Amino acid sequence: QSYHSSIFFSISKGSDKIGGLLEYLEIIKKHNINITRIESRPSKTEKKDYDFFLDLEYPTENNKEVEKVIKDLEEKGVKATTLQESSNQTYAPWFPRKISDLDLFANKVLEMGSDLTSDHPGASDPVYRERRREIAKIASTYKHGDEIPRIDYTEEEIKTWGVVYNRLKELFPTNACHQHAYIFPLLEQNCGYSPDNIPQLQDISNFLQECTGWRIRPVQGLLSARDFLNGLAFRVFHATQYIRHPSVPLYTPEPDCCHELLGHVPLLADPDFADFSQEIGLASIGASDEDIQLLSTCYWFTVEFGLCKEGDTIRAYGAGILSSTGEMEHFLTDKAKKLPFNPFDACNTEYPITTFQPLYYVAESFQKAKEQMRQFADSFKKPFSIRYNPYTQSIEILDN
Amino acid sequence: QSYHSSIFFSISKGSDKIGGLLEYLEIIKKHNINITRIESRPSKTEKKDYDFFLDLEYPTENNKEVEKVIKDLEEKGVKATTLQESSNQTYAPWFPRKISDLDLFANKPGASDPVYRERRREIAKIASTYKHGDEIPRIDYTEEEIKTWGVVYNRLKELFPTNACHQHAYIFPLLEQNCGYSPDNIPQLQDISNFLQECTGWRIRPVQGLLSARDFLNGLAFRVFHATQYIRHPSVPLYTPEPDCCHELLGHVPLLADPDFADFSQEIGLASIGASDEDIQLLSTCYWFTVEFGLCKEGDTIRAYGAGILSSTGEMEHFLTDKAKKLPFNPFDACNTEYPITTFQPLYYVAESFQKAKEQMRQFADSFKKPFSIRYNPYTQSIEILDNK
Ligand SMILES: O=S(=O)(O)CCN1CCN(CCS(=O)(=O)O)CC1
Ligand SMILES: O=S(=O)(O)CCN1CCN(CCS(=O)(=O)O)CC1
Ligand SMILES: [Fe+3]
Ligand SMILES: [Fe+3]
Numbered sequence: 001q002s003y004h005s006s007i008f009f010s011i012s013k014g015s016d017k018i019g020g021l022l023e024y025l026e027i028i029k030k031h032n033i034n035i036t037r038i039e040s041r042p043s044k045t046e047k048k049d050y051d052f053f054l055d056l057e058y059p060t061e062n063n064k065e066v067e068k069v070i071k072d073l074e075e076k077g078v079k080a081t082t083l084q085e086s087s088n089q090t091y092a093p094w095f096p097r098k099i100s101d102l103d104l105f106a107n108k109v110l111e112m113g114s115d116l117t118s119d120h121p122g123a124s125d126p127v128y129r130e131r132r133r134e135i136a137k138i139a140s141t142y143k144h145g146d147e148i149p150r151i152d153y154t155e156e157e158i159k160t161w162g163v164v165y166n167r168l169k170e171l172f173p174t175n176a177c178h179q180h181a182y183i184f185p186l187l188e189q190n191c192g193y194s195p196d197n198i199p200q201l202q203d204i205s206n207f208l209q210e211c212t213g214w215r216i217r218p219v220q221g222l223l224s225a226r227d228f229l230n231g232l233a234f235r236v237f238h239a240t241q242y243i244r245h246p247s248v249p250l251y252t253p254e255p256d257c258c259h260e261l262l263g264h265v266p267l268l269a270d271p272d273f274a275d276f277s278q279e280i281g282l283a284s285i286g287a288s289d290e291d292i293q294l295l296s297t298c299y300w301f302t303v304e305f306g307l308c309k310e311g312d313t314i315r316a317y318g319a320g321i322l323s324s325t326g327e328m329e330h331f332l333t334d335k336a337k338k339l340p341f342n343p344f345d346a347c348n349t350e351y352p353i354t355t356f357q358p359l360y361y362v363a364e365s366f367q368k369a370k371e372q373m374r375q376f377a378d379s380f381k382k383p384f385s386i387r388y389n390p391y392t393q394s395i396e397i398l399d400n
Numbered sequence: 401q402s403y404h405s406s407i408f409f410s411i412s413k414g415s416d417k418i419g420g421l422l423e424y425l426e427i428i429k430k431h432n433i434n435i436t437r438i439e440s441r442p443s444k445t446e447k448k449d450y451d452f453f454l455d456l457e458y459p460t461e462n463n464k465e466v467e468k469v470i471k472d473l474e475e476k477g478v479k480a481t482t483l484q485e486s487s488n489q490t491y492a493p494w495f496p497r498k499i500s501d502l503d504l505f506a507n508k509p510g511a512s513d514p515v516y517r518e519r520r521r522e523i524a525k526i527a528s529t530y531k532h533g534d535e536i537p538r539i540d541y542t543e544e545e546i547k548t549w550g551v552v553y554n555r556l557k558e559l560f561p562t563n564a565c566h567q568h569a570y571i572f573p574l575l576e577q578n579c580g581y582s583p584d585n586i587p588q589l590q591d592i593s594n595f596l597q598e599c600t601g602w603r604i605r606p607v608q609g610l611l612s613a614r615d616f617l618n619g620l621a622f623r624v625f626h627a628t629q630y631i632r633h634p635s636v637p638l639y640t641p642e643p644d645c646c647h648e649l650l651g652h653v654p655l656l657a658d659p660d661f662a663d664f665s666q667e668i669g670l671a672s673i674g675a676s677d678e679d680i681q682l683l684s685t686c687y688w689f690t691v692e693f694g695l696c697k698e699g700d701t702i703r704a705y706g707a708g709i710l711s712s713t714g715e716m717e718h719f720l721t722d723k724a725k726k727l728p729f730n731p732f733d734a735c736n737t738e739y740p741i742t743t744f745q746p747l748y749y750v751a752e753s754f755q756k757a758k759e760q761m762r763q764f765a766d767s768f769k770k771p772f773s774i775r776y777n778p779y780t781q782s783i784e785i786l787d788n789k
Contacts, residue, residue: 013570040574041574042599042657042658042659048570182448209780211780212779269442390601392597392601
């Protein structure tokens, strides 16, 4: 594995330091074995300035080489700011800058890829293990700009999907929030949602891009929370392509395609939910490890297991609920507590990952949850503020 | 050659007619080979409504079969609005709705040199393979072509600092540093597109066939610039009317990296989306007196931002002369001003600022008759159609 650092600085058009700076950069472009990219762009905050971006990768954490680069660079008369992937707090946390920089995550999957747990129903199924390998390879080799490869799903795989699909769809009209009921016929009409067929990520991605500008990247398995959440800042949802083992169709701890496509996807075609999800993403950009953990908890209690109130009734929008017959049939009962959602209240709350939730949070609306997440993000100590530019598909850094 | 039609209609959630509607749509999809696409989306106005889009393609103009489809469709209980590519005015003008639809445009002094004419065909062939989503194919330029680029480059670079608007001087070193701009090498469109995308969201497509004014201007609405890759004949010194790659890359491209200019250019494109033929002509002429031959005001000086000035030494010399008339840019004045294409311009229009020109264009285009309100959504990168007319 590798650790990324980024160095950035600005210089005004017409500075007599530009000539020497460019010479210095050409040198390290050729001779520095950790430099991966050097780019310059118009400043987004000062019309007469240029921004420079230096990206590096190092084999070890806290690699003292970057200090050498900073020193050399500042001898050319510019003031560098450095971001780094690290457990240390020497520099503020690194983040991907460009939507295409999500390619860096491609081979960073923690678990639930082609390495299964011994109690996994398919752990000793040689055909299933080979399949998981095959499908994982696709995510590992996927690049921004590519079409997502279509999977030729087998008859057994399609059968498992159908069992899940048919069980869940009976419960949606009575248990899901109305945005789900609004969006679902469009998925049938445009993305091939049906019991007889597993929808392809590329079709879903195209549909979401045109609705809310969200898009899908295939992923091997679980990413780290920072990486997954950072992807959300770009309105990019990482989704798996494999399906759960046929022997246990009504439950799995893994985010298989049933969970992604039936739980996560529909709400992303709703503009307010889409903005809310991106807000969570933006909050994570360059956030401390502590705050990432708070954001994961907020995500759990909203995107994964959130409830909405409609009149006197409670409905589910959380993906973990919408994709589980158990959970759908649990939340409506008085067997679980409900509280109004508030990131300052919810972020500290504990939760089980191997049972139904004993506590759910109810959001008033996705617009209010968005505004609430922005208050939360602002309460973080961040070295700078950030801003998404949909035209350039890029994070812009702002002072203070 | 193909004539595209589009049929739009809306239907409410929980309508009684949806079932039969969907059935009808699935049958014609299967059995009508002229139906290329049928799609439905959330409405941009009524939160409870669905928008439907039917795309059709026929070999001839004003195909009577469209009417038949409108009829059967409207029998299922919806009110259809039809747009069409046609020289007639039975239907309002068709337009591309997403960036990939620009694929539909694709098929559509010493030039009497057989080698050079064979070369032009070859470059067109290499370009002809491009479709949205691809990398723009690179051109392996010949030794002579690169030599010609070098002469034009070095000459024009001598004049820019004293004659070009400040945005051009600002961006050019970035083109040098990130896109390989130099006199020794011709930059490839794919590198330029990537850089533009990362500055202002603008993209390049290679020119395949030559584009109608409607098609080219419609491209601008998606912040897509069509650019040619061929290089001028050597017998062309500076033809001082030569829309080759030198003109695209040294003239048009640098300004597209300026955020305000990039918005102004797209504004012209938006105005063109679904505009009548006579309104398209107004916009082409506005485009000529701005994007191609416009001047800017810099303090007490006049400078050039027009690509046709920036890529012509003769034009750059000519605009500052007193015999060249200058006027403040006003689209109502500029839009029906006649102009020469094979001589220097006797008249130039001067823009105060690109944000002002953008606002002027939007005001200019506000009364254009259209069946729909048109707008651009930066998150979806698509045209939103509002049925509020
Ligand atoms: O419906 S679509 O998904 O196509 C675009 C929805 N759009 C997203 C961006 N926000 C403002 C961003 S912010 O200023 O609140 O950060 C307005 C609503
Ligand atoms: O592409 S860039 O990131 O460089 C700037 C994109 N540009 C910014 C300014 N807004 C003005 C909307 S309005 O002022 O007309 O309402 C249009 C989009
Ligand atoms: Fe999930
Ligand atoms: Fe031109």
